[PDB]
Amino acid sequence: MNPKRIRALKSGKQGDGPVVYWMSRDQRAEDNWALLFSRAIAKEANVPVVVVFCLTDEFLEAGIRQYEFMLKGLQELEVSLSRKKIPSFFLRGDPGEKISRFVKDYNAGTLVTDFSPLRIKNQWIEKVISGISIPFFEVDAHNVVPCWEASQKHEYAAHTFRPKLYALLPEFLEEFPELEPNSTLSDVLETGVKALLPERALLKNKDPLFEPWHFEPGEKAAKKVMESFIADRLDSYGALRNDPTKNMLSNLSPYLHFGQISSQRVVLEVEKAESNPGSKKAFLDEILIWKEISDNFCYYNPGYDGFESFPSWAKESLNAHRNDVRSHIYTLEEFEAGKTHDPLWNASQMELLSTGKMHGYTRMYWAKKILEWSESPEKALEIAICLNDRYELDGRDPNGYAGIAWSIGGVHDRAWGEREVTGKIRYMSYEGCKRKFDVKLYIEKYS
Ligand SMILES: Cc1cc2nc3c(=O)[nH]c(=O)nc-3n(C[C@H](O)[C@H](O)[C@H](O)COP(=O)(O)OP(=O)(O)OC[C@H]3O[C@@H](n4cnc5c(N)ncnc54)[C@H](O)[C@@H]3O)c2cc1C
């Protein structure tokens, strides 16, 4: 219940109404700091807390793979909130109009939301802040250490963010107090899929390319995945994290992006488990440093998805190599269907198209080749963002924009050997990947 997790967006006349928690990023009932704070404020006001979720008009920019995963978890979430006598309301439309009307209609007393440094979340905040008079609060329920508390500026590298984050771990890494009780979605899903059906990803015979049996949605499935990762996969994480032929990753990203499981709950469970110190240190670096530095990248850089947020050395190196003749130039549709001359690159595209989750190691290869085979670094940014946000189940996430900015613009990275086209950006060759893992085995799986 650390008060540093709370931030004030707009002070106003405190109403004597039910506390409305605006759920956006953390779609879960257990281990939610935003949901717990709203219940704590509700009790002090002798008012009942409620949960609201907004189904926005931007869902048609993605695919059914993300829509179904999110809505199915919300169906489970509604039942869980009903266990604690917490009514959940789902609105369709723009949050600026829907949240303002719901607050006025329900005579809400306090408004609470979860933290998201993305631009579209900031867009909805400005509209809502201009249409309400009740107090507005936001809570970092996604990071172990609050985004504004870990660092007050943009961090240039991970070796400067790591000591800052670990110095606050004894304060913010704590257990979750219980959510004490308050003392149709199937129809929306049906019409949504009907609107997204014309743009469904299909192969030649019109069979759907997506396979939805790899990651089942819901808060329940995330816990079983977490338990299976610790017992079965945590020991070999340090030595097999970069081998895509083996499914040794944790597979928590689709659940983490939608907030179906708390990352802090993962850290708390991993810290107790007795495993290889090397593997535990490698996993904690990914879920604590790189995950939360990604939120830091989106929170302190308004242009996190543009060439303007690259480091100065990368901008100068890429600019000096703009006129360099590219070995090949593929358009967006050739990249979408895996029509390149690198069977390793396409093999990643098939895995992304069929499973919605490309391996972490091949994700770096995938994003850097788009830089090599595009007209400008800016057009590489657009294609990488477009492909990642359309087909990744964990897409439209600060991890994506920071991850893409890492591969193409060398954000949170250092300069390497000067090359053509790519300049000083870290290079990854087809020769180097064969020396690290069985490339042919990865290719044959995704053909
Ligand atoms: C170009 C590019 C784009 C990416 N786009 C996304 C994205 O849109 N959404 C997304 O969630 N991840 C993205 N990743 C980050 C990373 O690849 C994934 O988080 C990770 O692969 C997710 O699968 P996992 O949980 O089974 O891997 P694990 O090895 O099990 O990692 C566990 C968790 O640590 C975090 N993590 C791991 N690697 C990174 C990383 N490089 N940066 C930040 N956090 C990390 C993730 O939350 C991850 O769930 C991207 C990486 C790159 C290089």
Side-chain angles (χ1 to χ4, degrees), residues 66-82 84 86-93 95-96 99 102-103 105-106 108-128 130-133 135-152 154-183 185 188-189 191-193 195-203 205 207-223 225-235 237-245 248-286:
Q66 288 105 346
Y67 197 68
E68 246 176 27
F69 194 92
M70 185 181 78
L71 269 310
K72 277 157 129 217
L74 289 182
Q75 281 208 145
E76 174 189 323
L77 169 133
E78 182 143 26
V79 176
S80 304
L81 293 178
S82 286
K84 324 243 190 200
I86 327 185
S88 47
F89 317 105
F90 296 91
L91 299 149
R92 318 154 82 220
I99 291 327
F102 182 86
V103 161
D105 288 15
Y106 221 85
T110 317
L111 193 77
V112 187
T113 197
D114 42 55
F115 174 73
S116 175
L118 294 186
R119 184 170 312 129
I120 301 199
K121 179 49 178 244
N122 285 9
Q123 177 61 74
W124 296 330
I125 280 172
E126 315 311 330
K127 322 207 208 191
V128 168
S130 69
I132 64 168
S133 325
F136 203 158
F137 264 144
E138 95 179 332
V139 178
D140 192 336
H142 217 85
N143 302 295
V144 174
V145 171
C147 182
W148 47 88
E149 283 295 321
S151 285
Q152 284 73 44
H154 161 82
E155 296 298 327
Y156 171 86
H159 67 260
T160 84
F161 190 67
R162 200 161 28 231
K164 294 194 188 188
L165 196 281
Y166 278 56
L168 300 174
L169 262 197
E171 320 208 347
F172 287 107
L173 183 50
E174 59 218 303
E175 304 273 8
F176 281 90
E178 187 98 295
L179 183 81
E180 68 223 5
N182 239 12
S183 297
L185 280 182
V188 152
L189 186 50
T191 169
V193 181
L196 290 127
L197 261 183
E199 312 267 88
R200 173 63 93 144
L202 308 171
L203 210 36
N205 50 24
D207 268 7
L209 201 32
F210 185 63
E211 299 165 354
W213 66 79
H214 289 263
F215 316 102
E216 318 282 5
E219 204 171 347
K220 239 157 274 201
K223 270 173 208 124
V225 166
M226 166 175 74
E227 277 142 39
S228 163
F229 164 67
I230 293 157
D232 295 335
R233 276 172 325 222
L234 179 55
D235 287 10
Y237 183 96
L240 304 182
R241 59 184 266 87
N242 276 168
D243 199 295
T245 71
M248 201 64 31
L249 304 192
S250 70
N251 318 301
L252 286 120
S253 68
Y255 308 99
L256 284 177
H257 156 72
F258 287 109
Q260 286 182 7
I261 190 168
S262 157
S263 71
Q264 187 172 333
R265 171 61 58 196
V266 187
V267 188
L268 283 164
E269 288 314 311
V270 165
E271 282 276 0
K272 325 180 312 318
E274 268 65 35
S275 267
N276 313 50
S279 282
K280 276 178 63 162
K281 195 44 67 191
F283 185 65
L284 284 171
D285 278 347
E286 297 297 330

